[PDB]
Design an enzyme around this catalytic site. Structure first.
Site, PDB file in Angstrom:
ATOM      1  N   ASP A   1       0.036  -5.892   9.395  1.00  0.00           N
ATOM      2  CA  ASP A   1      -0.905  -4.837   9.095  1.00  0.00           C
ATOM      3  C   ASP A   1      -2.199  -5.633   8.896  1.00  0.00           C
ATOM      4  O   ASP A   1      -2.223  -6.450   7.990  1.00  0.00           O
ATOM      5  CB  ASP A   1      -0.660  -4.198   7.721  1.00  0.00           C
ATOM      6  CG  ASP A   1      -1.331  -2.840   7.485  1.00  0.00           C
ATOM      7  OD1 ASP A   1      -2.101  -2.351   8.280  1.00  0.00           O
ATOM      8  OD2 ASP A   1      -0.997  -2.200   6.362  1.00  0.00           O
TER       9      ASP A   1
ATOM     10  N   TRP B   1       0.892  -1.155   0.000  1.00  0.00           N
ATOM     11  CA  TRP B   1       0.000   0.000   0.000  1.00  0.00           C
ATOM     12  C   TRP B   1       0.941   1.218   0.000  1.00  0.00           C
ATOM     13  O   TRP B   1       2.029   1.208   0.570  1.00  0.00           O
ATOM     14  CB  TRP B   1      -0.829  -0.001   1.278  1.00  0.00           C
ATOM     15  CG  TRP B   1      -1.665   1.183   1.662  1.00  0.00           C
ATOM     16  CD1 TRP B   1      -2.592   1.877   0.944  1.00  0.00           C
ATOM     17  CD2 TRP B   1      -1.725   1.727   2.980  1.00  0.00           C
ATOM     18  NE1 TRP B   1      -3.186   2.843   1.734  1.00  0.00           N
ATOM     19  CE2 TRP B   1      -2.678   2.735   2.999  1.00  0.00           C
ATOM     20  CE3 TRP B   1      -1.016   1.460   4.121  1.00  0.00           C
ATOM     21  CZ2 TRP B   1      -2.957   3.424   4.142  1.00  0.00           C
ATOM     22  CZ3 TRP B   1      -1.309   2.136   5.256  1.00  0.00           C
ATOM     23  CH2 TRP B   1      -2.250   3.131   5.265  1.00  0.00           C
TER      24      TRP B   1
ATOM     25  N   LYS C   1     -12.839  -0.236   7.872  1.00  0.00           N
ATOM     26  CA  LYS C   1     -13.532  -0.905   6.802  1.00  0.00           C
ATOM     27  C   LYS C   1     -14.547  -1.903   7.302  1.00  0.00           C
ATOM     28  O   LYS C   1     -15.763  -1.783   7.027  1.00  0.00           O
ATOM     29  CB  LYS C   1     -12.434  -1.446   5.907  1.00  0.00           C
ATOM     30  CG  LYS C   1     -11.584  -0.349   5.235  1.00  0.00           C
ATOM     31  CD  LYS C   1     -10.145  -0.469   5.690  1.00  0.00           C
ATOM     32  CE  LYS C   1      -9.215   0.520   5.015  1.00  0.00           C
ATOM     33  NZ  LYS C   1      -7.842   0.284   5.535  1.00  0.00           N
TER      34      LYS C   1
HETATM   35  C1  LIG Z   1      -6.791   0.803   5.040  1.00  0.00           C
HETATM   36  C2  LIG Z   1      -5.523   0.225   5.307  1.00  0.00           C
HETATM   37  C3  LIG Z   1      -4.917   0.485   6.538  1.00  0.00           C
HETATM   38  C4  LIG Z   1      -5.646   1.377   7.611  1.00  0.00           C
HETATM   39  O1  LIG Z   1      -6.458   2.501   7.233  1.00  0.00           O
HETATM   40  P1  LIG Z   1      -6.934   3.662   8.261  1.00  0.00           P
HETATM   41  O2  LIG Z   1      -7.752   4.679   7.556  1.00  0.00           O
HETATM   42  O3  LIG Z   1      -5.681   4.371   8.830  1.00  0.00           O
HETATM   43  O4  LIG Z   1      -7.648   3.076   9.387  1.00  0.00           O
HETATM   44  C5  LIG Z   1      -3.723  -0.057   6.835  1.00  0.00           C
HETATM   45  N1  LIG Z   1      -3.173  -0.781   5.906  1.00  0.00           N
HETATM   46  C6  LIG Z   1      -3.654  -1.083   4.695  1.00  0.00           C
HETATM   47  C7  LIG Z   1      -2.789  -1.974   3.838  1.00  0.00           C
HETATM   48  C8  LIG Z   1      -4.902  -0.542   4.420  1.00  0.00           C
HETATM   49  O5  LIG Z   1      -5.421  -0.820   3.228  1.00  0.00           O
END
Ligand SMILES: *Cc1c(COP(=O)(O)O)cnc(C)c1O
Ligand SMILES: *Cc1c(COP(=O)(O)O)cnc(C)c1O
Lengths: 401, 401
Positions: free
Chosen positions: B214, B133, B250
């Site tokens: 994560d 990401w 999510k």
């Molecule tokens: C969405 C996501 C997160 C966390 O998102 P937040 O808006 O900070 O809660 C962490 N890692 C990955 C790979 C994500 O897709």
């Protein structure tokens, strides 16, 4: 032997850990004057009325929970800059500011710190007033900056050391950063008079220092929000481009909600844009985006005339209470036979009292009567109820006799 | 000139920046398939029913807004650990873990990075999958860590490159950091199978790397929360002592309320207590204490049986939805006449689809059809409804034909 075998036990937060302790105490007479959180007359947490109402309008509006922009809720962002700068503000009116919503005043102070760290090209020294709210230090030090200090409070006077403040200040090296509290100096309780503010500002201007204002108790110094932003706006009006931290924590009593903001005074509207993008790029990797409910509550009250009016009367009421508390405080103190001078209790402003108590004095209060406060003799006068002013007094006396 | 006369105008966030753009497009037909944010079958933000319920009990509870402790609300805390670890969890049962509430996933990732930098002495390099990401990079970088990578996704075959991954992995220097997405690899949407996960464990144990998990979509890959934490849990039983980040963004659809947590598995309860101290010491000068709304809710659901039940049914329903859209999407692509194989659309799990489209194609989607996605051609599947599914199909057909 593993990973974390080496990590040692850190201590408890000097302020925050008092609550911790506090909570463990079985005495029913206990009070927590550690941190500065307002209690009402029955010693209870008080959620302002406009907060409730706004809470309700949000509910009834059945809103979504989608993400906020990195900078936060625009509507809140702007309301904040106005609240601060004033509606008739050039800087305001000409669009030269940038303001990003933050995680209350602490988070706000920090992104501010980190922004200085990354772009401020002329020094890493930040001058704090003696004494200063404890967190100042770690906020700036963890950010990458080094800390300096300028004299401010005179303990033999139990008043500001203007002279020393000005000698020190006047000697800070050109283009350094100076942290100035907007009002309600934590923990002293003493702030400069207009005439003196007027003075400081000339030297800041004169020495061409970056002035960083932290405004956490706007409204609490006097109960008048604009009379409290005087200083800040003055400075700005003399041509001093400051930076500022704001918190709606106390004044709106949105403590755990986390609502604050960080603003930077720029030259143009163009600079402002430019800086915002960077601000944002600083944030994304920090927390991605801010927590939305606090700003919603707050944005609603700032921008809803009714809500706004009520708010302001509530704020005034808060201040007023406290004041009554000081007053009741010293009188009972005498009533109790205390030969000491307790006028400081009444002359200071804001949420505390810088009592003068020694650390032994301090301990005894915790131990014998479960009155919780900070090692510096600093007491949240705002957490004292009518029904407990008297106990405080006795305790103090007892400790002081 | 000016304090900031040199501050350059930075570029918009690669992901979060599409939303900005998106908001500006005036076409009634736009679709925001950028960020991974779920919409109901009518393309509308979906606030979970259990979410709606919990907020109702908090309002009815007429609760206060006082500050939360540094690490946060204990119930929330305790709950996420459990949520993650499992109840029959040994590490959980013994209390060898420390969880601190955080600012959703980012702020958790971030404190975790900040902790690592401070205390993990055996290395400064964090190994990221290729690709990862976007935000991971800056989070670690900004945190002061060094970035590395291991092979992950083979684009030729559009599938995980277990072989390369394994080569890369086995040669990571000992005691380094490797980041691993617990499930729902973002943006690939391609995870190791249980047997590969069991391989992976073996070497991290062997090279004796620090595993940073994560975990953002717990429940979205499979539709089952326990199934989604299998590897996390796997590694733990295998004796790999992990660090982990959680988002409730999510799976609880609590986006702007910012709720999440960070947790480090320790040797003892004793040791956890020592880390916790440190951890808090890191947070105070960061944002003093976390936002409270989101946690109350989350903890309300994770801790109230009815609530927990319906949540599970709500999350499963969410998961099935996206499977419907996936499928429909491909069959719609067929009917429109798309020469190509669009199997990956149905092979990939989580909210997205890593489409393989080229920049131009994506540019064309935004411009002609107003369909917004990340330049790496990653579409938000969770963003499509029954009602717009065709549009997308036609679009993707026209841009690819
Ligand atoms: C969405 C996501 C997160 C966390 O998102 P937040 O808006 O900070 O809660 C962490 N890692 C990955 C790979 C994500 O897709
Ligand atoms: C309260 C306070 C702040 C900000 O605190 P938050 O709760 O994080 O908003 C900043 N400075 C001082 C001096 C304070 O007293």
């Amino acid at each position: 032997s593993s990973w974390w075998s080496h990590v040692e036990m850190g201590p408890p937060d000097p302020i925050l850990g008092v609550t911790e302790a506090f909570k463990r105490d079985t005495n029913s007479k206990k009070m927590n004057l550690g941190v500065g959180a307002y209690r009402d007359d029955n010693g209870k947490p008080y959620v302002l009325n406009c907060v409730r109402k706004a809470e309700a309008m949000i509910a009834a509006k059945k809103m979504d929970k989608e993400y906020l922009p990195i900078a936060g809720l625009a509507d809140f962002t702007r309301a904040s800059a106005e609240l601060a700068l004033g509606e008739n503000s050039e800087a305001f009116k000409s669009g030269r500011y940038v303001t990003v919503q933050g995680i209350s005043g602490t988070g706000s102070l920090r992104v501010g710190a980190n922004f200085l760290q990354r772009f401020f090209k002329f020094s890493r020294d930040v001058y704090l007033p003696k004494p200063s709210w404890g967190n100042h230090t770690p906020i700036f030090r963890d950010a990458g900056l080094q800390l300096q200090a300028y004299r401010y409070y005179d303990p033999k006077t139990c008043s500001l050391d203007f002279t020393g403040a000005m000698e020190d200040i006047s000697k800070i090296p050109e283009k350094s950063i100076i942290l100035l509290h907007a009002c309600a100096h934590n923990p002293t309780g003493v702030d400069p008079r207009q005439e003196q503010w007027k003075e400081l500002a000339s030297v800041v201007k004169k020495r061409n220092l970056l002035a960083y204002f932290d405004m956490a108790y706007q409204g609490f110094a006097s109960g008048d929000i604009n009379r409290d932003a005087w200083a800040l706006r003055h400075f700005i009006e003399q041509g001093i481009d400051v930076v500022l931290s704001q918190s709606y924590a106390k004044n709106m009593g949105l403590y755990g909600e986390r609502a604050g903001a960080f603003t930077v005074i720029c030259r143009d509207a163009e600079e402002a844009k430019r800086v915002e993008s960077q601000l944002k790029i600083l944030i994304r990797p920090m927390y991605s985006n801010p927590p939305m409910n606090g700003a919603r509550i707050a944005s609603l009250i700032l921008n809803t005339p009714e809500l706004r009016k009520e708010w302001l009367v509530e704020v005034k009421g808060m201040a007023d209470r406290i004041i009554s508390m000081r007053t009741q405080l010293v009188s009972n103190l005498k009533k109790e036979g205390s030969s000491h001078n307790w006028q400081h209790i009444t002359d200071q402003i804001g949420m505390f009292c810088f009592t003068g108590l020694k650390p032994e004095q301090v301990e005894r209060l915790t131990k014998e009567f479960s009155i919780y406060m900070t090692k510096d003799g600093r007491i949240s006068v705002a957490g004292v109820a009518s029904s407990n002013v008297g106990y405080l007094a006795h305790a103090i006396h007892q400790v002081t006799k």
